[PDB]
């Protein structure tokens, strides 16, 4: 086809051309240079005048729409060679302006490919590792160099394995040290993040050079952009951590108050939360919820006494206090088992005899058991009341704790999207999970109370089990878009969202 464009040249009138797409670029350029009386048309290449001003090749020339504004520019190969030479100049103002142009052009893959194939990567890292540090614009010069280096690496042409490890150690040292120039920190964080996300070997080297506290300390500053690349680097470490070692890493960051620091410095910060930051919060929240996946898909081993002891503990907390008689021995082994079995019926388990079988269902697996124990140990008052008010299965209107807690845990996993890998587009996150160290377990506690309130508000029976759960799912889902900044606020909206309320709201 034929596309009409205009091509510009500094200090001269633009040329209006009808581009024949069947015609070679070299021929077109030759004619253009003839119009402006320019020698050596082989020196030049077409380039967009506006926007990113990308170089144009024979493969990308299809995207040139009608009315596009182009510029006759120095060819990417010739420019790459000129700039690399100017970076080895005796004049330093020469090198600052050269490096500044490198920081701009390195984003263009057409230019980057040329510069990289001129041993460009090692040219830059060697400027960083042994440049002259005594001069007026050292930090400025370093910043542009790091910018150009990163943009070159982000084209997926050069493996991080080829990058000098002393260079990487130096960059990591900029992050671990008490304070560095703010722009140097940003470049360093961005580099380390990209290295982690795009390799395996180098990932192990970061945990050596930089401690958890040091990486978290970059969240305690006013600069929102710093905070953003700080969490980006943290999210990268979590994301590409081996399943083997993710839980320990989450513990290490938690024991140094990663959550509360983000809560106070970002969510409760002075300046508004920007789009880039909101995305990293989404990513972080997705990654933390994914920690539950292992336990969610972990089937209980009924033959493991250590796992059965957890259920024994649940039964013990519920039914065995000092107000109760002593099941002293003399009571047959068949008689003691009879009492245990009834307890498991009163606890609402399906398999009354061996309740461990209830947790072979994955999802929610052992995660449901962890939630029950958490409720029993942290909120005994709540656990006790729930199981005692719903003890007799003979009563048709009572709610089985076991069957409910298992289903609820499954339900909460679906709503929170546990076992999902974060995309690049989402910015949505639930703020209240940043307000407590065990937010998921607290959520279960609140929702199991909700479940019981909703159950008795519907005057439900065992036959209506699935119907109640459907209501509870809707109650929780409706309270979320209001985006509560605390678990108490979330609990408050649940109070208003009673069964009588939700029924009214689909009449609409």
Residue numbers in the entry: 6 to 513
Reported in the publication:
In the present study, we perform a detailed biochemical characterization of the BAI1/ELMO2 interaction, and find that an evolutionarily conserved fragment located in the intracellular region of BAI1 specifically binds to the RBD-ARR-ELMO (RAE) tandem of ELMO2. To elucidate the assembly of BAI1/ELMO2 complex, we solve the crystal structures of the RAE tandem of ELMO2 and its complex with BAI1 at 2.5-Å and 1.7-Å resolutions, respectively. The RBD, ARR and ELMO domains of ELMO2 bind tightly and form a structural and functional supramodule, creating a highly conserved elongated concave groove capable of specifically binding to the BAI1 fragment. Each member consists of the Ras-binding domain (RBD), the armadillo repeats domain (ARR), the engulfment and motility (ELMO) domain, the pleckstrin homology (PH) domain and the C-terminal proline rich region (PRR).
Diffraction-quality crystals of ELMO-RAE belong to the C2221 space group. In the structure, the ELMO2-RAE forms an elongated superhelical architecture that consists of three domains: the N-terminal RBD domain (aa 1-80), the ARR domain (aa 81-301), and the ELMO domain (aa 306-513). The RBD domain adopts a typical ubiquitin-like superfold, which closely resembles the RBD of FHOD1, consistent with the previous bioinformatic analyses. The ARR domain contains five armadillo repeats (ARMs), though the ARM-1 is not complete. The ELMO domain has an all α-helical topology, composed of 11 α-helices. A Dali26 search suggests that the ELMO domain represent a novel fold with a global architecture. Notably, a 16-residue flexible loop (421LQVGELPNEGRNDYHP436) between α6 and α7 of the ELMO domain interacts tightly with the ARR domain (see below for the detail). In the RBD-ARR binding interface, Y60RBD inserted into the hydrophobic pocket formed by Pro81, Ala84, Leu88, Leu110, and Phe116 from ARR domain, which is similar to RBD-ARR interface occurred in FHOD1. The ARR-ELMO binding interface could be separated into two parts: (1) a 16-residue flexible loop between α6 and α7 of ELMO domain forms extensive hydrogen bonds with the residues from α14 of ARR domain, such as H284ARR-R431ELMO and N295ARR-E425ELMO interactions. (2) the distal side of ARR domain binds tightly to ELMO domain via extensive hydrophobic interactions. The second interface is further reinforced by additional polar interactions like R264ARR-D442 ELMO and R300ARR-D375ELMO pairs. It is worth noting that most of the residues involved in the binding interfaces are conserved among the ELMO family proteins, suggesting that the supramodular folding of RAE tandem is a common feature for all ELMOs.
